[PDB]
């Protein structure tokens, strides 16, 4: 009942944020305390595990306005990411490989979290991976999209980790992901509430804590975790072959 409350970031640097994602993933054992991690990026787009570059981003436009390009452990689509966006990610003890549950219980946290805020928000209901909204892994404030979401389960554990806009460039985002408006199916959470990103953060500090009956306390990452991440980072995150989608 006890948990990690990790607030670790990287800002300027995606591809290191990723793999600390990672290392607190693999580093895990069963029946370690159950861990929740905030952290933010700056103007970068994210690929799934299974795509590829130059697919969903124009690899020049991102060269033009100074667009990291990083790819994640974890499969789902292409985002776009910048400090007005919130991620966060969940590590704890699994007893199965349900996918479908794991967002469930996720995604009843993050509504009761916004509840708390006055923001009145629901998870998405089609299932399928390719289109851009309105799916299991989103939630949706009205009809419009402010979360993401994307995860993977190993024996004894699985990893959760979301993206939600709080005070991100639409229209950049927009932009910068091919798809084929966009724009109007998305919003951020402040077009609903006047609310900053550490109001959003404790809120769903509650609501996670709450729903899932953890009691998350303020800790820091350990050296074999920031071991492994560097790790991780040296040998992988921070190649192309990775980022472009060979490795
Ligand atoms: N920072 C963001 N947070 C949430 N949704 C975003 C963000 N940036 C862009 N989006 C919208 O979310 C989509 C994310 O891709 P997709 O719908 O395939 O799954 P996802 O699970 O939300 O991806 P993540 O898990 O967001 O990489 C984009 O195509 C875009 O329409
Ligand atoms: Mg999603």
Same mark, same amino acid.
Not at 8 to 37: C, H, V, W
Not at 82 to 101: A, C, E, H, P
Not at 127 to 155: C, F, H, L, Q, Y
């Given at each position: 009942?006890?948990?990690?409350?990790?607030?670790?970031?990287? *800002?300027?640097?995606?591809?290191?944020?990723?793999?600390?994602?990672?290392?607190?993933?693999?580093?895990?054992?069963?029946?370690?305390? *159950?861990? +929740?991690? %905030?952290?933010?990026?700056?103007?970068?787009?994210?690929? =799934?595990? %299974?795509? $590829?570059? @130059?697919? @969903?981003?124009?690899?020049?436009?991102?060269?033009?306005? =100074?667009?990291? +390009?990083?790819?994640?452990?974890?499969? #789902?689509?292409? $985002?776009?990411?910048?400090?007005?966006?919130?991620?966060?990610? $969940?590590?704890? !003890?699994?007893?199965?490989?349900?996918?479908?549950?794991?967002?469930?219980?996720? /995604?009843?946290?993050?509504? /009761?979290?916004?509840?708390?805020?006055?923001?009145?928000?629901? *998870? #998405?209901?089609?299932? &399928?991976?390719?289109?851009?909204?309105?799916?299991?892994? &989103?939630?949706?404030?009205?009809?419009?999209?402010?979360? #993401?979401?994307?995860?993977?389960?190993?024996? #004894?554990?699985?990893?959760?980790?979301?993206?939600?806009?709080?005070?991100?460039?639409?229209?950049?985002? !927009?932009?910068?992901?091919?798809? *084929?408006?966009?724009?109007?199916?998305?919003?951020?959470?402040?077009?609903?509430?006047? $609310? !900053?990103? &550490?109001?959003?953060?404790?809120? +769903?500090?509650?609501? %996670?804590?709450?729903?899932?009956?953890? &009691?998350?306390?303020?800790?820091?990452?350990? @050296?074999?975790?920031?071991? +492994?991440?560097?790790?991780?980072?040296?040998?992988?995150? !921070?190649?192309?072959?990775?980022?472009?989608?060979?490795?």
């Amino acid at each position: 009942m006890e948990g990690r409350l990790l607030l670790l970031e990287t *800002p300027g640097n995606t591809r290191m944020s990723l793999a600390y994602d990672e290392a607190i993933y693999r580093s895990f054992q069963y029946g370690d305390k *159950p861990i +929740l991690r %905030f952290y933010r990026h700056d103007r970068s787009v994210i690929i =799934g595990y %299974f795509q $590829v570059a @130059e697919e @969903e981003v124009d690899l020049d436009y991102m060269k033009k306005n =100074g667009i990291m +390009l990083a790819r994640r452990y974890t499969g #789902g689509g292409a $985002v776009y990411h910048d400090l007005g966006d919130l991620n966060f990610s $969940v590590v704890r !003890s699994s007893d199965d490989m349900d996918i479908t549950s794991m967002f469930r219980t996720m /995604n009843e946290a993050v509504v /009761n979290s916004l509840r708390i805020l006055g923001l009145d928000a629901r *998870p #998405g209901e089609l299932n &399928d991976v390719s289109i851009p909204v309105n799916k299991k892994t &989103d939630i949706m404030a009205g009809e419009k999209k402010i979360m #993401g979401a994307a995860g993977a389960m190993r024996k #004894g554990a699985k990893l959760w980790h979301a993206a939600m806009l709080v005070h991100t460039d639409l229209d950049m985002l !927009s932009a910068v992901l091919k798809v *084929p408006s966009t724009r109007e199916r998305v919003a951020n959470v402040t077009d609903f509430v006047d $609310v !900053s990103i &550490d109001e959003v953060r404790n809120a +769903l500090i509650r609501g %996670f804590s709450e729903t899932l009956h953890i &009691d998350f306390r303020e800790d820091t990452i350990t @050296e074999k975790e920031e071991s +492994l991440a560097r790790e991780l980072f040296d040998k992988k995150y !921070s190649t192309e072959e990775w980022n472009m989608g060979l490795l």
